[PDB]
Structure 1
Amino acid sequence: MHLICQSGDVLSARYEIVDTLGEGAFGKVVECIDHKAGGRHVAVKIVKNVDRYCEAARSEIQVLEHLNTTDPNSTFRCVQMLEWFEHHGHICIVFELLGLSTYDFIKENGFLPFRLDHIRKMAYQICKSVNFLHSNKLTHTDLKPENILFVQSDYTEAYNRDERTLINPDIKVVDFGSATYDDEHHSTLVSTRHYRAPEVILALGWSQPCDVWSIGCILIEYYLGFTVFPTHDSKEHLAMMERILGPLPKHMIQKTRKRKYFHHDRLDWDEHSSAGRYVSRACKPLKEFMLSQDVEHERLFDLIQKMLEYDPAKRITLREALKHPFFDLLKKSI
Structure 2
Amino acid sequence: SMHLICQSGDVLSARYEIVDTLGEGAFGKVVECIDHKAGGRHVAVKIVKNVDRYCEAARSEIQVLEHLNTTDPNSTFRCVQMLEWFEHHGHICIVFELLGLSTYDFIKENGFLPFRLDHIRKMAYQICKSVNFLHSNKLTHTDLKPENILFVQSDYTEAYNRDERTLINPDIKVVDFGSATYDDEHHSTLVSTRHYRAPEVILALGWSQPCDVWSIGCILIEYYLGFTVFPTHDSKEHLAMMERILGPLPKHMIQKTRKRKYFHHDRLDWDEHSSAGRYVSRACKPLKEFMLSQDVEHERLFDLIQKMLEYDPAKRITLREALKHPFFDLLKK
Contact 1:192 1:232 in 2 (8 A): no
Contact 1:153 1:167 in 2 (8 A): yes
Q: 1:66 to 1:314 in 2, by over 3 A?
A: same
| Unaligned 5+ runs, structure 2 | none
Contact 1:261 1:267 in 2 (8 A): yes
Give the Cα separation in 1 of the matches to 2:190 and 2:203: 10
Contact 2:142 2:191 in 1 (8 A): no
Instruction: Note the C-alpha offset of 1:188.
Output: 2.1
Contact 1:244 1:283 in 2 (8 A): yes
Contact 2:143 2:191 in 1 (8 A): no
Deviations 1:254-274 (A, max 9, x none): 000000000011000111111
Contact 1:212 1:318 in 2 (8 A): yes
Contact 2:22 2:32 in 1 (8 A): yes
Instruction: Note the C-alpha offset of 1:93.
Output: 0.3
Deviations 1:186-210 (A, max 9, x none): 0123364331100000000000000
Give the Cα separation in 2 of the matches to 1:194 and 1:149: 19
Aligned to 1:205: 206
Give the Cα separation in 2 of the matches to 1:191 and 1:215: 12
Contact 1:101 1:146 in 2 (8 A): yes
Give the Cα separation in 2 of the matches to 1:192 and 1:300: 23
Instruction: Note the C-alpha offset of 1:159.
Output: 1.1
Contact 1:10 1:17 in 2 (8 A): yes
Aligned to 2:21: 20
Give the Cα separation in 2 of the matches to 1:267 and 1:37: 58
Contact 2:229 2:284 in 1 (8 A): yes
Deviations 1:149-191 (A, max 9, x none): 0000000001111100000000000000000000000012336
Contact 2:145 2:193 in 1 (8 A): no
Give the Cα separation in 2 of the matches to 1:144 and 1:271: 29
Give the Cα separation in 1 of the matches to 2:157 and 2:235: 39
Which secondary structure does the structure 1 equivalent of 2:195 belong to? coil
Structure 1 stretches of at least 4 aligned residues deviating more than 4 Å after TM superposition: none
Contact 2:143 2:192 in 1 (8 A): no
1:255 aligns with 2:256: yes
Deviations 1:195-253 (A, max 9, x none): 11000000000000000000000000000000101112110100000000000000100
Deviations 1:38-95 (A, max 9, x none): 0000000000000000000000000000000000000000000000000000000000
Q: How many residues align?
A: 332
**TM-score normalised by length of structure 1:** 0.99
Contact 2:58 2:178 in 1 (8 A): yes
Contact 2:142 2:192 in 1 (8 A): no
**TM-score normalised by length of structure 2:** 0.99
Give the Cα separation in 1 of the matches to 2:283 and 2:94: 39
